[PDB]
Design a protein around this ligand. Structure first.
Ligand SMILES: *[C@@H]1O[C@H](CO)[C@@H](O[C@@H]2O[C@H](CO)[C@@H](O[C@@H]3O[C@H](CO[C@H]4O[C@H](CO)[C@@H](O)[C@H](O)[C@@H]4O)[C@@H](O)[C@H](O)[C@@H]3O)[C@H](O)[C@H]2NC(C)=O)[C@H](O)[C@H]1NC(C)=O
Ligand SMILES: *[C@@H]1O[C@H](CO)[C@@H](O[C@@H]2O[C@H](CO)[C@@H](O[C@@H]3O[C@H](CO)[C@@H](O)[C@H](O)[C@@H]3O)[C@H](O)[C@H]2NC(C)=O)[C@H](O)[C@H]1NC(C)=O
Ligand SMILES: *[C@@H]1O[C@H](CO)[C@@H](O[C@@H]2O[C@H](CO)[C@@H](O[C@@H]3O[C@H](CO)[C@@H](O)[C@H](O)[C@@H]3O)[C@H](O)[C@H]2NC(C)=O)[C@H](O)[C@H]1NC(C)=O
Ligand SMILES: *[C@@H]1O[C@H](CO)[C@@H](O[C@@H]2O[C@H](CO)[C@@H](O[C@@H]3O[C@H](CO)[C@@H](O)[C@H](O)[C@@H]3O)[C@H](O)[C@H]2NC(C)=O)[C@H](O)[C@H]1NC(C)=O
Ligand SMILES: *[C@@H]1O[C@H](CO)[C@@H](O[C@@H]2O[C@H](CO)[C@@H](O[C@@H]3O[C@H](CO)[C@@H](O)[C@H](O)[C@@H]3O)[C@H](O)[C@H]2NC(C)=O)[C@H](O)[C@H]1NC(C)=O
Ligand SMILES: *[C@@H]1O[C@H](CO)[C@@H](O[C@@H]2O[C@H](CO)[C@@H](O)[C@H](O)[C@H]2NC(C)=O)[C@H](O)[C@H]1NC(C)=O
Ligand SMILES: *[C@@H]1O[C@H](CO)[C@@H](O[C@@H]2O[C@H](CO)[C@@H](O)[C@H](O)[C@H]2NC(C)=O)[C@H](O)[C@H]1NC(C)=O
Ligand SMILES: *[C@@H]1O[C@H](CO)[C@@H](O[C@@H]2O[C@H](CO)[C@@H](O)[C@H](O)[C@H]2NC(C)=O)[C@H](O)[C@H]1NC(C)=O
Ligand SMILES: *[C@@H]1O[C@H](CO)[C@@H](O[C@@H]2O[C@H](CO)[C@@H](O)[C@H](O)[C@H]2NC(C)=O)[C@H](O)[C@H]1NC(C)=O
Ligand SMILES: *[C@@H]1O[C@H](CO)[C@@H](O)[C@H](O)[C@H]1NC(C)=O
Ligand SMILES: *[C@@H]1O[C@H](CO)[C@@H](O)[C@H](O)[C@H]1NC(C)=O
Ligand SMILES: *[C@@H]1O[C@H](CO)[C@@H](O)[C@H](O)[C@H]1NC(C)=O
Ligand SMILES: *[C@@H]1O[C@H](CO)[C@@H](O)[C@H](O)[C@H]1NC(C)=O
Ligand SMILES: *[C@@H]1O[C@H](CO)[C@@H](O)[C@H](O)[C@H]1NC(C)=O
Ligand SMILES: *[C@@H]1O[C@H](CO)[C@@H](O)[C@H](O)[C@H]1NC(C)=O
Ligand SMILES: [Cl-]
Ligand SMILES: [Cu+2]
Ligand SMILES: [Cu+2]
Ligand SMILES: [Cu+2]
Ligand SMILES: [Cu+2]
Ligand SMILES: [Cu+2]
Ligand SMILES: [Cu+2]
Ligand SMILES: [Cu+2]
Ligand SMILES: [Cu+2]
Lengths: 558, 558
């Protein structure tokens, strides 16, 4: 943080700027930012909107956990003490690649066993090889829907000059019913609408009027950086600010070229760092959270979830301009974003084959009704025996339920075609997410309305020309369009077991996931004795605790 | 028509005006309006938007049939000659009560056997006991989806003065794929969006630009009566005119007290007579067809279906003001409408009993996937042996599949609670329509977002107060809200077999229907020797034709 000034945000330190390939070069700071998480179960907790919730799971007694702040090249260490009654836990660091530190990913039944309750602990330590905005959450089923969530801000350079960094701005769905009850509900029923949408942890109740709108004070004439996150379990958001444009400087944790838009689509898990110029008249302006796609990717019972953007020195109160409804994004993220640091892949060479195809299908023949299958199999990870235990014991007999897609290719690009139930009854859009990598969104089926139920299968005769291998969007989460397909690509530079799943909590609970066992033969040697011992320590403590649990495992575990 | 002038539309003739009970008093004009319907099957037909359709079934070689225009009291006589290749037919007169003329209703497998093809004929004769706007269509499955539709205009008095009667304005969904192929698609798949939406038999293709917008010429300063109809197979419309208000003077074929609105919801089969005042600046204005209810009750591949309303003396071309999007009606018709001629019913005396409760359920366990059941049974009428045949032969052993809800009540109000799959995975909105009557809409479940998946079961403690029995909306079509309930009421004044079904073509084909066999004992004695002979004649000709038909019956028949 030497040469980083408001006028020159492109610079950071010697050898490190916005054009430096962050996936291969990282600043040697030697600084460690430590945090302690205390997961406690609170019954009959008073919510931000005046409504009392039956049960919540909280980190350090707050709605969200600590705002993790570190610099590019720092090491983030977190001790997670589980003081919940029955539930196990883990903390997944979404957007953190976890380069050669696979066992710190937090994916239950994959990279670790769940940390046992009644005082169980584990200390996560990872290097911040990427700068930007990210988030953390539990990976114990849909436990993060109870409140085990928070934000990660790794400071670094930018693709546009700005004066003030307003920090994190998480927008999430809010349900009065607990996550485990909602997983049981969605197994046999269609997903419900949210009761409210929280902006920076606050929202107003549409029935009573209680609570408060989020208040962001803008300094007149200054460029402000705002880090918008979607920490939701199901809801996909469309965000807009009345009489203002937002300039995207980053998509997820990948800095992109300046892209000025009127509105932004945020899928579950997606982040967007924007530059907002306080260029308009001194007044209060509404920041609106709308829903497009015709309820194909969510909705809220709060008809107008909003936040207030207040200009400093201007009068207070509620904004008078209700605004103009934004463009219907049709449950799709923009593929116009072009990364600052480029990547190139041959797209003409692609051929649709079974070992590169991941068909997402909805099975309505079994018990329960909503069972999501990827390649004819719904994922069901083993909390007692993770995929890493198999790696450490030289065991290759992975169960069909673990959905292991073994990628043996070394440091090469791998192409993946994900099909969204073309022959099925109906289709829903899916926020596809990959652990341990930022993928290249090469292409998707034609942008059509989400509830249209229009189908598209990959036809090389029209679609090979629709792909872009010259600096395509690089991110950790993107939309799988309803009724169609999606083409992705990631370079195998990080040996480990990585989940690739839909980020809608109900869908991943239903089974929408695969496990990319990347370079298994290379993985075993890269695991330190410290990580192995600790992996085995937590698994032993969990295997001892499980027979005393009064509740069963109703879902996938992921 | 004697005293019906632009300043006094309330008057009609001696003893007949807007306040007279049309349901029990009718003018004796002694005049008859005759029409001959020639149903031809046209392959590779050129559509209004430029697209060539595989097959269509048309009356007298046009997009719609002729506009049946008669006065109140006149008798409408129509000879339907069936020159189709394979299909049987009938023409149902929607909105027309058919007072003591049950055998002219056109409901196949209920009131008649289908008129055979290759020259089969039958003459329908019915008295114009009601005035206002209505429509007619085929009742041979979803055959009307191929183009066997048309409008009915029975002139009479109105509830507000106007100068010009612009006539009928039929708005319908338009599909490139034929009806029988769509019934087959919807049996196992979710209904698709319409390819386009025709307004008065015309539209512009959103991809090519071929075709024309509907052009209505408004005269400056004069009050214009517009008769808006929704003749769709699935699509439910929201209609609005840029910079103008619409003053509703009639809901279906029931005249209502003046009600000014900015927008109107029209369910499948709904009509609305509005008065548009040409009180704005001389220009071209857009008439917009929008979709609310977040695609719960339809949508279109044409993002903006519209018509042009040109003021006489103004310049030509397309309207420059795109306008502001209207309010989301959430797939619900307005219940604020109050009929001119009132009706009063006790709503406090209502008790939910199995013999007054009609549960709508979607069965997903059998083959095909989408099978709609009412009270545990999906309707399946017998084209070869109709309900009237059972009445004429003294046979009371009505099949389970005929869904006979026998109402013995003589000239008394009957209350029906229709439930919308409260315990099911998902629930869709249903435009409930009744034959031979105009029902009283006493109440429905609390108005909530259409695809919110909020459920409501009738709870006497909070719902009995929510009902209205003092001049409630009287019409033949209304919305059964998604996940809720609907309380209807009709006076048993017309003995006969009457269909009560969802008007979405695909849903009635799936089985969403019951048959109100009203006053059986009174019915046999009220059937004329001419109607009995015609019925048997058409049934003998159809039963003789059927074994030669190369296609089977894949749906309900309704
Ligand atoms: C009333 O007249 C209608 C007009 O002829 C009859 O509809 C026809 O019914 C037959 C039998 O159900 C259909 O044939 C079936 O079609 C489906 C789907 O094929 C269609 O789509 C594919 C793909 O786009 C295309 O390749 C075909 O050419 C078709 O367009 C097949 O899966 C079945 O095996 C079978 O071939 C006709 O398609 C349908 N025609 C139309 C224009 O609707 C109807 O049966 C008559 N009703 C009665 C009871 O007489
Ligand atoms: C993690 O801790 C949560 C919180 O206690 C556990 O959730 C609870 O799970 C039980 C059993 O699935 C739920 O009970 C069920 O309640 C419904 C009524 O809603 C009833 O019909 C069923 O028969 C059953 O008794 C309970 O509602 C639910 N609590 C909440 C607030 O979500 C969860 O089981 C724990 N997970 C594990 C595997 O330890
Ligand atoms: C959002 O937060 C901002 C603070 O960051 C609130 O703005 C503050 O609003 C008050 C009035 O509500 C302003 O004070 C007033 O100043 C006038 C002029 O001197 C005086 O006559 C009044 O008696 C009062 O003191 C205050 O200046 C302003 N703060 C800043 C830094 O501009 C705003 O009210 C909050 N919005 C909501 C809805 O809570
Ligand atoms: C952005 O969020 C704001 C605040 O949530 C939204 O403003 C709200 O807009 C609705 C109408 O769109 C207002 O309610 C309406 O009030 C009128 C009475 O004037 C009534 O006739 C309607 O039935 C409805 O109840 C609401 O009062 C207003 N909030 C405030 C405090 O002014 C705004 O609409 C959102 N902007 C967009 C484009 O989504
Ligand atoms: C009522 O119907 C009219 C006619 O269909 C609608 O006008 C149309 O509005 C759309 C979008 O609002 C216009 O398309 C847009 O064009 C611009 C470029 O000109 C493009 O950047 C957008 O992506 C979009 O394609 C369209 O030109 C316009 N039609 C014509 C011929 O003027 C109107 O929006 C409807 N009103 C409402 C409130 O529904
Ligand atoms: C999806 O499942 C199918 C079936 O299990 C897999 O297809 C087989 O792939 C192997 C190569 O790994 C081929 O040798 C077989 O011929 C394929 N089966 C057939 C007959 O289609 C496919 O690999 C799986 N996809 C992934 C990547 O998980
Ligand atoms: C609906 O479209 C029809 C055309 O099919 C219109 O009727 C024609 O109107 C023109 C101009 O008034 C006359 O010259 C023709 O003789 C009419 N033909 C018919 C069908 O009789 C009709 O006016 C349109 N309805 C509205 C109000 O827009
Ligand atoms: C809608 O129809 C009217 C005719 O009633 C058209 O208006 C005429 O347009 C011409 C050429 O633009 C003018 O010279 C005349 O003065 C207009 N006559 C009238 C009736 O005032 C109008 O152009 C049509 N709109 C479209 C787009 O077809
Ligand atoms: C719906 O089906 C149910 C069950 O077949 C019918 O309920 C029966 O109604 C008769 C007449 O009132 C009673 O004698 C039986 O005791 C009822 N059985 C039950 C379930 O309690 C009901 O009548 C049907 N509803 C309609 C209007 O068709
Ligand atoms: C966690 O927080 C609870 C509630 O404040 C407290 O009682 C407990 O001692 C804490 N546990 C640890 C070890 O931090
Ligand atoms: C978000 O809320 C926090 C309260 O913990 C506040 O300090 C911060 O400024 C808010 N962020 C903005 C500017 O929206
Ligand atoms: C935005 O706000 C300014 C300040 O009040 C106002 O003058 C302007 O008209 C608004 N912009 C729009 C949408 O017209
Ligand atoms: C691999 O794991 C399975 C599942 O626990 C076990 O039954 C089997 O014995 C193991 N095989 C090896 C090679 O250890
Ligand atoms: C119906 O119209 C067709 C096509 O014009 C014609 O061939 C046929 O003779 C007509 N049938 C009758 C009896 O009108
Ligand atoms: C009455 O109808 C049923 C059903 O079609 C039939 O089985 C029975 O024979 C009929 N009764 C007579 C004698 O007409
Ligand atoms: Cl009718
Ligand atoms: Cu995540
Ligand atoms: Cu992740
Ligand atoms: Cu999903
Ligand atoms: Cu994950
Ligand atoms: Cu009808
Ligand atoms: Cu009808
Ligand atoms: Cu229906
Ligand atoms: Cu009908």
């Amino acid at each position: 943080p030497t040469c980083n000034t408001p006028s020159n945000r492109a610079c950071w330190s010697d050898g490190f700027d916005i054009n430096t390939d962050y996936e291969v070069s990282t600043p040697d700071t030697g600084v460690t930012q430590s945090y302690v998480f205390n997961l406690t179960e609170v019954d009959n907790w008073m919510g931000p909107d005046g409504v009392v919730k039956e049960k919540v799971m909280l980190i350090n007694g707050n709605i969200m956990g600590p705002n993790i702040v570190a610099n590019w090249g720092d090491t983030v260490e977190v001790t997670v003490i589980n003081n919940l009654v029955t539930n196990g836990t883990s903390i997944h660091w979404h957007g953190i690649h976890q380069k050669d530190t696979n066992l710190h990913d937090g994916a239950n039944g994959v990279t670790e066993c769940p940390i046992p309750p009644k005082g169980g602990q584990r200390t996560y330590r990872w290097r911040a090889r990427q700068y930007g905005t990210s988030w953390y959450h539990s990976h114990f089923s849909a436990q993060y829907g109870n409140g085990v969530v928070g934000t990660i801000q790794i400071n670094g350079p930018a693709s546009l000059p700005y004066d003030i960094d307003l920090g994190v701005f998480p927008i999430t769905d809010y349900y009065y019913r607990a996550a485990d009850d909602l997983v049981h509900f969605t197994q046999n029923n269609a997903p419900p609408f949210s009761d409210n949408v929280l902006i920076n942890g606050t929202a107003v109740n549409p029935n009573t009027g209680e609570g408060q709108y989020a208040n962001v004070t803008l300094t007149p004439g200054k460029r402000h950086r705002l880090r918008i996150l979607n920490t939701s379990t199901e809801n996909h958001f469309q965000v807009s600010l009345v009489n203002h444009t937002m300039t995207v400087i980053a998509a997820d944790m990948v800095p992109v070229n300046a892209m000025t838009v009127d509105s932004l689509f945020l899928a579950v898990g997606q982040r967007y760092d924007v530059v907002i110029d306080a260029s308009r008249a001194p007044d209060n302006y509404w920041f609106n959270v709308t829903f497009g796609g015709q309820a194909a990717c969510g909705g809220s019972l709060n008809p107008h979830p909003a936040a207030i953007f207040h200009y400093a020195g201007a009068p207070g109160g509620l904004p008078t301009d209700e605004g103009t409804p934004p463009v219907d994004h049709q449950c799709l993220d923009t593929l116009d974003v072009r990364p600052v640091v480029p990547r190139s892949v041959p797209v003409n060479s692609f051929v649709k084959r079974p070992d590169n195809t991941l068909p997402v299908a909805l099975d309505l023949t079994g018990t329960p009704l909503f069972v999501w299958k990827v390649n004819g199999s719904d994922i069901n990870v083993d909390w007692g025996k993770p995929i890493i235990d198999y790696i450490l014991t030289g065991n290759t007999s992975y169960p069909v339920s673990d959905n292991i897609v073994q990628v043996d290719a070394v440091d090469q690009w791998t192409y993946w075609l994900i099909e969204n139930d073309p022959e099925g009854p109906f289709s829903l859009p899916h926020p596809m997410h990959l652990h341990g990598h930022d993928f290249l969104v090469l292409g998707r089926s034609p942008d059509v309305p989400a509830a249209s139920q229009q189908r598209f299968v990959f036809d090389p005769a029209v679609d090979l020309a629709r792909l872009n291998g010259d600096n395509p969007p690089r991110r950790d989460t993107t939309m799988l369009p309803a009724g169609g397909w999606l083409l992705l690509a990631f370079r195998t530079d990080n040996p480990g077991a990585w989940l690739f799943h839909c980020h809608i909590a109900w869908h991943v609970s239903g089974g929408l996931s695969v496990d990319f066992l990347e370079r298994p033969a290379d993985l075993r040697q890269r695991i330190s004795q410290e990580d192995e011992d600790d992996f085995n320590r937590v698994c032993d403590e969990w295997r001892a605790y499980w027979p005393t649990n009064p509740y069963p495992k109703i879902d996938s575990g992921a």
